[PDB]
Amino acid sequence: GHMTTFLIKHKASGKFLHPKGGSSNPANDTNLVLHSDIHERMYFQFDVVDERWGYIKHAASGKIVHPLGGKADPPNETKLVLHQDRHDRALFAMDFFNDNIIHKAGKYIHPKGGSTNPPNETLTVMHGDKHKAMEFIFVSPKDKDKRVLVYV
Amino acid sequence: MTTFLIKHKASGKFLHPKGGSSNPANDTNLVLHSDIHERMYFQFDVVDERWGYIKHAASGKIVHPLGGKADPPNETKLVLHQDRHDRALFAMDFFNDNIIHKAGKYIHPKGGSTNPPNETLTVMHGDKHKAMEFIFVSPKDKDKRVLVYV
Ligand SMILES: OC[C@H]1O[C@H](OC[C@H]2O[C@H](O[C@]3(CO)O[C@H](CO)[C@@H](O)[C@@H]3O)[C@H](O)[C@@H](O)[C@@H]2O)[C@H](O)[C@@H](O)[C@H]1O
Ligand SMILES: OC[C@H]1O[C@H](OC[C@H]2O[C@H](O[C@]3(CO)O[C@H](CO)[C@@H](O)[C@@H]3O)[C@H](O)[C@@H](O)[C@@H]2O)[C@H](O)[C@@H](O)[C@H]1O
Ligand SMILES: OC[C@H]1O[C@H](OC[C@H]2O[C@H](O[C@]3(CO)O[C@H](CO)[C@@H](O)[C@@H]3O)[C@H](O)[C@@H](O)[C@@H]2O)[C@H](O)[C@@H](O)[C@H]1O
Ligand SMILES: [Ca+2]
């Protein structure tokens, strides 16, 4: 009966996850990108569905993060997008102990190409690898260095 | 509801107040035991992001290192105590499956066995290994994990 609001910060670069174009209501299938700007159209919330699993929700639109096409077991390099649909293939967990975002089928959210310092507008993709450039922390919109609990 | 069982992953035993009371006294040891009942249900009261109080549901007492030191040494016994303060802050790491104190040590079965006998004490220890792993499960489905951050 309450969801915190937070920024998803790419730990190595200090950039954040955005809908591409920064819209308050991104069209379905809008890519999830990295970008350095901060504003309320890149705020997110986490809608808990089942223990660790839930929906990464764009605060302004209510659309949530999907592997493009909604496959349950997406291959490496599957693009992440926003979409209004809510179902089990858009379930992720926000690992705030190991600092990563993991999909229910076991791959992680990465910047495409795996750079520690990706350009603005770099796409995000699913990938099974674990390394410093797929780490993310979840921080206050009022203080981008203050971690906040996404599970309440 | 918001209650859960703290299950020792390797043995399937659970965290209990020693003696299984609904109203354990201050400084009652936290032990491992195979039984299940409402007097071994726990809750977690969030204080600051990941940090909070591990709470015995029936009594409201919370988990402390015995003596309440900020940086307790290895083998410090865990107990229940009504006091609230920052040396009783833990985080419930449901990704690595362990319970970590604010100063960085973890809750262990004393002696570190993957199959501790009933009534084995719990202690703080800085090492990480299979036998200090815990998962947090539904009272009505002892194999179903539940979210302790509420
Ligand atoms: O991408 C996340 C989305 O995946 C699934 O929906 C895919 C896509 O289907 C529809 O688009 C069409 C069908 O009209 O299918 C292809 C692309 O797959 C397009 O040529 C065409 O527009 C929907 O209209 C799209 O919005 C949708 O993204 C899945 O069904 C969704 O739940 C969601 O997971
Ligand atoms: O996208 C996330 C993924 O990025 C990195 O892997 C990218 C890509 O690297 C390799 O492809 C090539 C092989 O020639 O290696 C360079 C590095 O990008 C590319 O120019 C070229 O396409 C792998 O063979 C691909 O499978 C891989 O997807 C990073 O290494 C991954 O850990 C991950 O972060
Ligand atoms: O164990 C957790 C508890 O540790 C600290 O309290 C220690 C101890 O204090 C009182 O015990 C006695 C006897 O009444 O009082 C002195 C210290 O004031 C101790 O040497 C002696 O044992 C309490 O009656 C005990 O319950 C308590 O264990 C800390 O102060 C507490 O906040 C709590 O963290
Ligand atoms: Ca749950």
Instruction: State the structure-solving technique.
Output: X-ray
Rounded to whole angstroms, the Cα distance separating A43 from A6 reads 6
Question: Does the C-beta of A28 come closer than 6 Å to ligand 1?
Answer: yes
Report strand pairing: B78-81 vs B141-145.
Answer: unpaired
Report strand pairing: B90-93 vs B106-109.
Answer: unpaired
**Span from the CA of A122 to the centroid of ligand 2 (angstroms):** 14
CA separation (Å) from B34 to A125, B94, B125?
44, 21, 22
- Residues of A whose CB is below 8 A from B149: 149, 151-152
CA separation (Å) from B16 to B38, B90, B132?
10, 17, 15
C-alpha atoms less than 13 angstroms from C-alpha of A39 in its C-beta half-sphere: 10
**Residues B17/B33, Cβ–Cβ less than 8 Å:** no
Rounded to whole angstroms, the Cα distance separating B107 from B122 reads 7
Three-state SS string over chain A comes to: CCCCCEEEEECCCCCEEEECCCCCCCCCCEEEEEECCCCHHHCEEEEEEECCEEEEEECCCCCEEEECCCCCCCCCCCEEEEECCCCHHHCEEEECCCCEEEECCCCEEEECCCCCCCCCCCEEEEECCCCHHHCEEEEECCEEEEECCCCC
Rounded to whole angstroms, the Cα distance separating A35 from A140 reads 17
- Residues of B whose CB is below 8 A from A98: 95-96
The shares of helix, strand and coil residues in chain B, as percent rounded to the nearest 5, are 5, 45, 50
Residue contact A93–B95, C-beta within 8 A: yes
> Cα-atom radius of gyration of chain A, to the nearest Å?
13
Q: Which residue of A has its CA nearest to B4?
A: A51
Q: Which of B91, B95, B33, B93 is nearest to B63 (CA)?
A: B91
> What is the identity of the amino acid at B19?
G
**Residues B51/B15, Cβ–Cβ less than 8 Å:** no
Long-range pairs of B127-132 with CB within 8 A, sequence gap ≥ 24: B128/B96, B128/B98, B130/B9, B130/B10, B131/B10, B132/B98, B132/B106, B132/B107, B132/B108
Backbone angles phi, psi at A105, to 5 degrees: -85, 0
For chain B, the maximum distance between any two Cα atoms, rounded to a whole number of angstroms, is 36
Resolution value (Å, 1 decimal): 1.6
Q: Give the domains, in start order, of chain A with CATH numbers.
A: 7-147 (2.80.10.50)
